[model samples]
Target chain A: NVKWEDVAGLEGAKEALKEAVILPVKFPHLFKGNRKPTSGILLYGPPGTGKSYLAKAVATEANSTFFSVSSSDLVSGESEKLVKQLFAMARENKPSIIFIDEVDALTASRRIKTELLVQMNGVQGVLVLGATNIPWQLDSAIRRRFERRIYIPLPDLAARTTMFEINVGDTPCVLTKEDYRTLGAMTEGYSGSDIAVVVKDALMQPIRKIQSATHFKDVLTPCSPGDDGAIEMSWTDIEADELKEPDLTIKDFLKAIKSTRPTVNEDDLLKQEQFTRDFG
Target chain B: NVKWEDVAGLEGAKEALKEAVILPVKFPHLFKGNRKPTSGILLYGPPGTGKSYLAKAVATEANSTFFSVSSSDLVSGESEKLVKQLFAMARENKPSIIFIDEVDALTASRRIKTELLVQMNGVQGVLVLGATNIPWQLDSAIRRRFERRIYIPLPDLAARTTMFEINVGDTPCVLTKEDYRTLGAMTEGYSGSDIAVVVKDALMQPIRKIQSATHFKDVLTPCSPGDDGAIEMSWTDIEADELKEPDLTIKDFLKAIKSTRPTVNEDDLLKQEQFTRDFG
Candidate 1:
């Protein structure tokens, strides 16, 4: 469970979410006690963009129980049983949040929707939060039931900068404001999830090298700190370390920018954009 | 137009392939005209394992025209047109190979199969080489059409050792036979393609470092190669200078092996094994 304060930026999304779900639930008298909370809200975006995190944050802020489910957990023979368990749990708790991550996979096409629809309609006073990177592939009927549909795009320059700061928090890396700005620009085609992966890879560069060396006997030597002696580490490692430093040097940022690339290609973006415009 | 001789090893596959398609095409009379030449031979495996290269080798060996079509190209509104052109070309030339790379994408489901089936059934003497790493996901109908299904697994220890020797052909990496054998053993899960990438990356390491230092302004300038009065060039420079020697040492081989990983995950392998046992 995450609080609103735990998440930085996205003021508009945060505000809208608070007003619609949090505030109404917290203060029912403001709306003449007629605050009929939404049954479901859909968060759609590219993978790894913190959709599940946002839902957890919402649940925390609302002081509601959180129930999570993913398509992989339901795709096997236990789908019907899983659906029943989800509805039963929702019915047990009045002010609860049911988060279905990657809902596109869980309640795919019309066939699966029939089963999900039955479950969704049965739960009373239950706020369902469905997240999907490919919402357009979801059943058309299921899309209509969600009262609020939010588009969680890739992190913009400002968000990316914040993300970098958050991820590297207090780590020893040199980075300049210009460096962050340049890195943000280079990540133009990246989704929030893709950005996270790039950051993760950058962070893991040194660790990977050490692990590689340890695993293979030919180069089996543990990398000791402050030992900038013979066999200076690869530039990839130096760049990764630089990202951790507080000074935020331009060189480190530039290296990170060059090393990482957007996972989503142009065709995928076009398809996602078209789907959003048409069905979102 | 890659030649079979250019391929480092896979004597078994090469030999079987020659007997299956090449010898018959090269000397039609030798086969007693009983050679039922497959319209296509699929070269499915992990990326960078040289599927396309193998296909090209096959084409060159058979002395037949090769038409390579990627799955994406087929899906991009050219399926029917591509199919027509393939049959038309095959009709003009009795022994022609239509190589479809990433065939799984084109024939993942049943609907995709129907379209491909219509096109495939139209032409005689048109061998179809449909390649895919995940052949199990391929449409059942499409899989049934291929007369031969070969498994191009990752190169074993012997193949890796051969690859190292071939790639480093006459290079002065100062490595011994023991080094080569150890390097091969180290590359347990690496596919042929992975080996190539690792090799490429390792080769670039020294050059990349030298270039990086030269480009950085703030870094202290190291003694130039021409400065005789200054401290004699260090081992780093000596190694850098020997870059032209083209010796892929134990170090390079180890680095390459460390960087490359098995592309197929356990879950995917399980699914593949199940499919093979049930169908193949």
Candidate 2:
């Protein structure tokens, strides 16, 4: 159920996925002759940057069967056979996507990787969408199997703002559009995951205040859309139903951001960019 | 839901299928080393001899995923690819059965047949059950792929009797054990399908008698288990609620047998038995 709009960034990566996996299935005639569709598409990026999310979105939007295999799922003693089965299932189910999250683990055994490459070559009407944090660690032959290797970079400013809004969906908040932009600007090197954590922490601030408060007073609160009469009292004396929770504000977001640092650093960003330039 | 008991005959064929497909899956350790399980099995015999029925029984009894692909399913321009997908799917769904009904059609395209052979070799924890009436029509290589060539022959006397009883299941009948034995003796050349049709025709005779009756008399008769007072009249004047259908009798069965001829002849039986001696 992951829609395209639910994903925050990587428009180019999304477009490439559609071209390789979705468009060819939806309009097979256009992909005939010189414009043959790609069999494998690699989505390489840092962890928690919406690579798998994009894969899900493509599967949802295209209405194709999706097989999401992780490292542990493929790391069997007879993994080569598993790989063959996976590819076969994908091929049997047309317009299918075999999303191998953390696909670099496939190289642990050459036989599994080899079988995957051979199957990718033979399979038709099925797309292999592999996601890996470390693109450089993949075997060269495995790397070549992917016709289009798109980099799923960290969310940009606009994308980070969008992520904030998406993560805060349906939650009552006092933070304005200007406040969300400010939060995005403040978290310079944040991944989508990092922004999500920040939003989560900010949302929990009112609960923490209520639990730790020494005193509480009656205040006209807008718990629902409209303002309601309040009769608050001491924190201990206030009943659960009468305890009005405060809405999320820019200050709460700032506090959350100040405490939570971005997961990806400048060095990691450089390495990711370098991978894109070299092989992505 | 075709249980082993539901299939009237082919005990040897059924045992062979269980050993080849079921036992290995249920107890993988028992089939290691020199006692390795077969990847492919051939079920060949004359038409209407419960070949496909046995396949269904094996699938149901084995509790494995079953793929029933007919001749038309594999007879395509892109059949080689489809063949790959089918085997792949079977392999992916472990302890699976790929029941190819009328498998002689696969030989129409050498590429598809070749692909099937290759896949059968590579697949593990999966069994390919191919049913064909014309075993002689299959390619030599394809024949060899099936390690165990099982001949699903016509139902014998006991089996034919069982089939008659099974076909008459839940229908109101006056056929005793003696009558079933007599019917079985009468159907010397009949296949399972032939017996089924015989039973079907016999069951319909009572309805036919009711419809064709010119006159009826009020007499003590049994429609239910116990005797009930029966009032019968002219067929045109008889109300459906008042009409009581007669139970199936040996006379009805004899009349049905006179009208329905066995589909397979002596020549076909000879050819089928000859196949068992040759390849099956």
Candidate 3:
């Protein structure tokens, strides 16, 4: 169900994934005993650029069963045995893709060339997918295992504009096409997740609007992370409530824009560019 | 009293500062009326790298009074008025240097060409100096006012070695030249203050030794940041216990090495280099 159309941007990256995952899934005989898809690939860049999103999408579309595991979990104390067991499972299942995420947490360098994987002289499957916040911090041995390395950078201008539209679509909103375009231009260093937060925060102007109109002593408060903002209670608790929803406006977006900082800074982006040029 | 030689590395930057501050102080007649030492000079770099130290040094070396103030302290809502008052104080006493520290905190691109600074156009004696962790955050107008921008980068290998030796010179250290060199090399990405923490942390290992020797129930509660590790006061409160000094050893340094980590990452370093090339 997770199709490529739902994902925003990353054209080259998606093309690479499509070739490695979907091509084989569509025509299995194409990757016969003589050849196979690129077994290992690395996805890396600043967080919130939809690395995990792409991984999940790719996983769902794979013809082979996808084994999703965090890299930290795979590279821990009994990592060698764990990886070997995974290879065994892949063989048993027939044509499997192993996806390892959060490679940033794994500093413990491990040489991984499973006996079964190496012996895949003409195997049709057994591709590996990896995601990391810090590709530079990754172990060289592990790095080499991933035959192809892709840089999943911060969302581009058009991609960012699309993100705003997708996120704000469900909300009661009032904005021109130019507003999203302006927002995308202004938010130069923002990541996918950061832009989503901006939309969420901007939408809260309605709650603020409700509190002000009623002059309610208890102003609507944004949830502190884990808890829901709205509370459900008995009649006694709900007695004086007359809150009304207001359309989210450009002013609200601008207000959110004023306070909400982009997760990736100019400096970090510069470094990412350097890393990509040097490695990718 | 802090001479140019006292500082480590940053040759070109230090050279520039000498021309801006030292030359003006040593010979006043050279800069007559309209022509003066650059009215403002900005110091920008990563934190803990000795910006404050050089600020103090320049302040002391100046032929004028050095009024130290954080840029955040002045850039608040009513900061313009506060700065006006400070300028009034500087006027009472002739030949003053208004030094602003940590201009990095300023995010707003506020235009502040106040009369107090402008009126001092002919007054060559009233020099302004500034320091910041992030120069890129500064308003271009404010940056324009500062004629010179000197970057105080992280310590080099030699500087780091010198830093370790200088900090531990009086302490009971048992380290050879090579040991110092090794510590320097190991701390590649470390800042000046970060290394200071390492020296201080390593000194505590002797106390760790004391805890192990006596099997002290409290073990060695690591010294509170400001408190000396040696001093002890019991419940009675009037006890004078002369704690013997322990020799800080290579093992202690190794232990400290395990505990201490560099604050700056590779991404920031790349940015710093880029900034240096583009602007500094």
Candidate 4:
């Protein structure tokens, strides 16, 4: 099961989907008569905000089948056949969630997804969900089909701390609570993927040192005896602990933070923020 | 009276106002029982689209007193006192419409208007109307008061042609229907004020010749003779008919059209259009 906790912070999105998927399964009678289960739900936000992961979590938690199709999958004839089959499958299952990721394909094949979504208007049991980095690209009509439109935004201060830990977990690191919190604050506009990349880059500093040591093994910094000003080194003491793994210091993480900038550009950030304000 | 026909091409706004203003005026008891007259209305669109003129037309047709205030009149202590008197006077009068032209004071006077509006909530008899070129400048709270929001767009092809006729009225001009249509099509993005400017500038071509002839009656256009093209003319002939008004030719208009671009800047146009799409 893709536990709701695994999807990180999307508390607004989480509670909304719970009512759509989990609550309906738990109490079917509550959704009958006057109260109908939401037929369609939309998950839209910037990339790497766990939109697709939320789809996974919804399917798992609801005990429904999770059918995910990449935006690229919506190409020409292949899309038409694939979409019809999955929609049928989703209908056959008791509780099913169809997640369409429309960020990658961009302008052209948006219609392929559009065709499938149009077919999903009044279907019962199957919850239609879609994720698009550019929500405006879907146009107002396609957007209207999904009754419950939720935005999965980038991590806030609290969520950023959580992401930092998740991305840099158990790598023989020595970062305190304050370190993670500060690092999270430093990466203001960074996505979850960007933080993961930062962690990878930070870890590489030690690997780079080790690789360089092979060619100049004897000429390396094995000298740590008397510290600073008038200092001397016992080459033997340095060689004694040469094999020990270097802990990722604050310097390493800061270096990584400096190099790895957030991938989302100014226009995308402004456009998405405005889209959320105006429509979401 | 600014008749409905006088405001060319705003068919939608004309009908909507008829329902709100004229319909209620004709049948008051219907409103007194179950239904009620709309308390507030909004006239919004680009500048020079006759929002102000519409306000005047409504006042004249309704036979109600029109209370007009400049946004520049919305300074500190002056705004509060002046607004209260006009608003109270507006309420006392049975059939009155308060039209606030907030093009310049869109932000400055919004607070004062909001204060006045909140005061007039359930009070009936008077209609509150406002016009703003930039509708997005007003917050949602202020906008919620207006029951019917009407858009007065720029002149379309037929509307522009109609405008050309209105602008060129009574002038000794030589232009066919095709010429007017072509001019209308040519000035696609021009607003009412812009077209008026075009007509004025084009009309000046004839005036310039007359003015030039007066300065040097002897040196005027030697009415193009035998082959020299603009050979010498008699000052006696200049004196004979020099004071007569010249007809406006097609070349004058075409030349004027080249010089008089639409006054509305790209920023204003784009911002207002995007705002309309998002919030209008």
Candidate 5:
């Protein structure tokens, strides 16, 4: 039931995801009642491509309760006991979204050779959304359990521009349309998270300069301003505060761009593609 | 010059890897410096208990090339590239060990940050061994260069016992041994690489069996009167060309009681204790 409009600039992937899970669930009759709701959908990619946000959007639109769980919270001590509890909780909340993040850690390919079959087999009805950066390392059995798998890649130039616009809003920034184009090009292989970080760092430059302005002024001031004719000025007057202003300059953006880099590497991309080809 | 004897247990890891790298390099002083050597010795670990493996062992005993590098490998892309090339071609005809391990992925840490500064400075050695499991996630600045990072884990009970025995060799595996009780209790949290894995898995069996006997007489033809009226088997009676026979049995050693798990959950542990404490 979640509309693609809620997510920005992933027309192709969104269409695929909608066909795989949404359409089937929204109009069961279109499938002659033959289609069963997917028990699991795995959304994997580099950190912060909005997997969790997308899951929330889906849950909100579907009017389904969202039960989010992280692997670290569930997999210690007696795995069977925790798994049973999770399933029970899910069943009690049908039409719910049971989202598991960083699933590779819990169902690591190596560790899942034993113990996972029972847990995965017992779960039903609730949509399981498992997220991970390294989907290739996820156990093959776990991967097979998912009805659909979607990869969230880094933002394209268009998408990055949209992201920049959304964050920049009407704030006065020295960045120009061409600068945005250049920035997008520079962020060739960056993940959504990396882009966010770069933007944040760029935005903070002005604030940082403002905070340090007083100190710099104090260092630049010669001795102290003597009492002019009438009254003596305080230390505050000797220190310059004119630099305390909120303005993100092109220089700031350039500096941020220089420092921030892609989190995912070429080898990782190749490995992910290899996994999808081999098992998906 | 660390000999296999100096390291207790880990017979499989050691034996399987011994002739491949260690011996030739270790006894070079005794062999007039002729040895097949790699560029580095990557030793990765959780925190303590000899990941460096008694540096004196390699420095004093092995007479060949030895250079240790770490995080400094990331000073600049050009520097990293130069270092990699230097190490690759250095000491072309001599045995050399270039150790570059234990560099934290995050650049925030003081120690690792400094080490990285040094490693980026240059590379002129053989066998560049850089150790890290999550190298890809390391700061893109430094991680792009290292060739490999071998995983090193804590020792198991068998290894601990062997280690104890090597340091105090007269002791045995039996639980009844008084020294065993004290030694076993003392080495509780050691790593497998710190100890051994094979001796731990093998000792669990009830007995170790070996074959010593072989039978060549054909028995499938059924016992019949031989030339001297003795029972003999014809070729038709023989089930196969070869006969089966039991060989030798060695009494099983009980599974060692002192088993240790990875004390450092590298990722989570670092995130929580090291990085979060400092950065958060």
Candidate 6:
């Protein structure tokens, strides 16, 4: 249900996933001989890095059936059998994707790991995508099977700007291209998740103004072809449709960034970098 | 990927699901005038009564896109938004079935329940199937939206017999029609789950015997058209292909039953019965 446009960043992941999945579908010949598509792909990063979103984008863009699961399902009582059935089903529906977010959950079960490792091999037309915040927690054998291990690092400048644009989409806003770029620059260490929160809180500013507004005035209504004068009324007095809420501004975003710090700290990012260097 | 044959019992659930999902798809015209398809359906029963299996069977039989989620997903931090998106995706993929097993997980979140109740209504072409062992745990508002609430009761005699047959499947077994019926009669109060364990344990008996075997003999090999007397060697000396494992017998099933009792106790059954009376 998620497309690349819906996913803000991780272009590296996008390219790799497209090559592994989308390209194979369009030009099946390239996938013959030694290049028979990487069956196991891993997306590792801190939480809220849009790893799951990137996985969904691959499924949507590739036009393949998507099966999503999480740690809870993998750690359940019958996970070993479930894992076997899961792979079998994926094979039944060829060109399908099995997305296991938080795949480190399988760390506790040796049987599950053995079964998964076995299924991950000899699989044709089915791609297994694994997402883990802590890649170090995974067993070496399990980690080794995911041939294409893509690091879903924190969003960069362009991705951050795009994230702001995507998050502010369809909402009444006056923030321009420059404003988004400025916001992106303003939050260098922030994750896509942090940017989303900033944008979300910024979007609420107009509504927050409405709730706290005491005075009323007359002004030209927004989104009107003709410059018709609309009378402003108190939030309680204004009709729901006629409420002329002020548009979102850069100030809203700046204020939100000031209050909301990035969840991923410097040490956490270093840990991710260490993992990428060692095993990525 | 499940079908009616994959599911052992719950004819009542099968019929109701067919009427709610299959009939509407087959005869779309019949769904007009005082009758639109039931958008929200619930499958409530004691654990391991084939609730999720029945749900999968509906999707498979109706030829609808199946989306499955469980309590773990529903109870996650972002369940409300996920629930909204889940419905939206189902609607986008018309004639889709969203099967949420262990739906009682939403009982903890009032906001999730509210959002789910809102989305459960006004949904078209997308059927929401909720399965829960504890039906009473759900709030009344959420429960009310499921106009077609079917109780996935425990398997009866015929289902039990069919369960044995299905569980044995293509395994090398000499069980006859009478043997299956006898096994079914033996387990009166057993859930489908219980019967599965019994069958599973019975199937293992042959291997268990092989592991402990100390004798060797000559016998006519099974599955051979020519009556060739194959020499039987001790378990350790026998080749994997030449092992003459004994067929599963009624005695094995009887022994399994003696060791593995029904998971759903009398008290649990009473609780299920009470809920069915109140909400069925």
Question: Each prediction's TM-score against the native?
Answer: 0.40, 0.49, 0.41, 0.43, 0.41, 0.51
How good is the docking of model 5, by CAPRI class? incorrect
The model with the greatest DockQ is 6
Interface RMSD of 2: 10.9
Q: Which regions of candidate 6 deviate over 4 angstroms? A: A5-11, A25-36, A72-91, A108-123, A211-243, B1-280
Clashes of 5: 26
How would you encode candidate 2's per-residue C-alpha lDDT over B160-237 as one tens digit per residue?
887778888889889999899899989888887898888898999887876665455444122332234333445667
> What DockQ does candidate 3 have relative to the true complex?
0.00
Candidate 3 TM-score over all chains jointly? 0.41
For B144-249, candidate 5 gives per-residue lDDT tens digits of 4443334344565545554544432332344435454455455566543334342343343322211211222232122224433323333334355443322211
Off by over 4 Å in 1: A1-280, B6-12, B29-40, B45-48, B108-115, B122-124, B165-182, B211-248
- Between prediction 4 and prediction 6, the one with superior TM-score is 6
Question: In DockQ, how does model 2 score against the reference complex?
Answer: 0.02
lDDT of 6 by residue, B169-277 (tens): 8877888899899889888888887888888889898778766544544451233223344344456777667656777788888898888888888888789888877
- Candidate 3's C-alpha runs over 4 A off are A1-280, B1-3, B33-35, B73-81, B108-123, B166-172, B175-181, B212-245
Worst 10 residues of 4 chain B by lDDT: B214-223
For candidate 1, what's the TM-score of chain A, rounded to 2 decimals? 0.72
TM-score of chain B of each: 0.72, 0.83, 0.76, 0.78, 0.40, 0.82
lDDT at A139, model 5? 76
Largest TM-score belongs to which candidate?
6
Clashes of each: 19, 0, 0, 0, 26, 0
Best by lDDT: 6
Give the lDDT of residue A172 in candidate 4: 69
lDDT of 3: 0.66
lDDT of 1 by residue, A65-105 (tens): 56677766556432454455555544544466778887787
